[model samples]
Target: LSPLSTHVLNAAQGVPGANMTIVLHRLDPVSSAWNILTTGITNDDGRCPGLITKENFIAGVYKMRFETGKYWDALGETCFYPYVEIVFTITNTSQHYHVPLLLSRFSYSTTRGS
Candidate 1:
């Protein structure tokens, strides 16, 4: 089954973004506001559990908020952005959506992965 997942790599440290806070949001057309879907923390491997199950997965706009400031704080480093947010869409439920983040203190990047 296609599922929604994510992982964070600490580009500056050359390691996983362990223990980083992650928040998931879904755009609600009815309220025209982003609604909180769920929240999770990165594992030691920088991977997060599936944000949505196949049954709940649908074609819609979704966003992920990564708390990078806290991650930097734990490492005693300063960061330019307090957090990194990614907005993406899923148009086909038959495909898996893997949003991976490559992050550093000053910059970050992401893409859809398998």
Candidate 2:
């Protein structure tokens, strides 16, 4: 089965957002709150493989929280934003969701995937 994944590209540096902490949260239907399902850190290619795997996901609204400030500090750089969170809907389960992050010291963006 196709799985859900993510890649973090550094917009300012022209590379992947490697070594950054990423957490996946599912919106709890009962509490209307986010519950952490899994967490990953970007690899050399700036990808967090298998952030969501088989038997671990359900159709719902989900979010990915990126730790930007800590990543910047790890690179000995300064970030304008402390953190970035992208919330999106997972309306389809048969398709793979590739959540890519275009990030910089000051800005970021996200979109739906195949």
Candidate 3:
């Protein structure tokens, strides 16, 4: 059994990326444009539970937008990159994906987790 989820750890603040805005977009193959599926804000735990659910789950390409620009602004900081976007594919909707982000002002990284 697998579920779709994401987590953010702010290396600059050394804490969970709380209250940050996120958006999910699904690529519409027919229309050739990304359709906004959902928008989420991370909690104190830096996790958005139920951000993606079985109801909207589909085996296709998707994009996640992390509003790091506004996030940093909220903290009274400046960053080089305004935002970060992750594009991924789900060939098997039944599989689990725990995308974890390690983020800082100038750099960021992610890993495939289950």
Candidate 4:
């Protein structure tokens, strides 16, 4: 089964968002609150290998919290945004969801990748 994954590209520096902290969360159906699901750090390839496992994944609203400020700070740099949170919907379980981020010091973008 395909698992949910993510990647971060450092647009400003033209590199990967390596070692970036990423937290995964899922919206609780009953409580209507977000619950922490899993956490991972990007590798040298700027990708979180597997954020969601086969058994844990379900069709619903999910959020990915990216610790952007901390990452830039570690590099002795400053950014405008403290962090980035991406909320997306998972409606089809049979398909793979690849969330990718293009980040910079003052801007960022995201898309649903293949």
Best by lDDT: 4
lDDT per residue, candidate 2, 76-108, as tens digits? Answer: 999998998998887767788888889888888
lDDT of 1 by residue, 59-101 (tens): 8999999999999998999899998899998788888789988
lDDT of each: 0.89, 0.86, 0.86, 0.91
For candidate 4, lDDT tens digit of each residue in 1-114? 337888899998899999999999999999999999988999999999768888888999999999999999999999898999999998888788888889999999998977
Pairs with steric clashes in candidate 3: none
The best candidate in terms of TM-score: 4
Winner by TM-score between candidate 4 and candidate 3 = 4
lDDT per residue as tens, model 3, 46-103: 9987767785788899888999899989999987879889999988877788876778
Give the higher-lDDT candidate: 1 or 4: 4
Report the lDDT of model 1 for residue 85: 91
Candidate 3: worst 10 consecutive residues by lDDT? 48-57
TM-score per candidate, in order? 0.94, 0.92, 0.94, 0.95
Quote model 3's TM-score: 0.94
Name the runs in model 3 displaced over 4 angstroms: none
Q: Between candidates 1 and 4, which one is better according to TM-score?
A: 4
TM-score of 2: 0.92
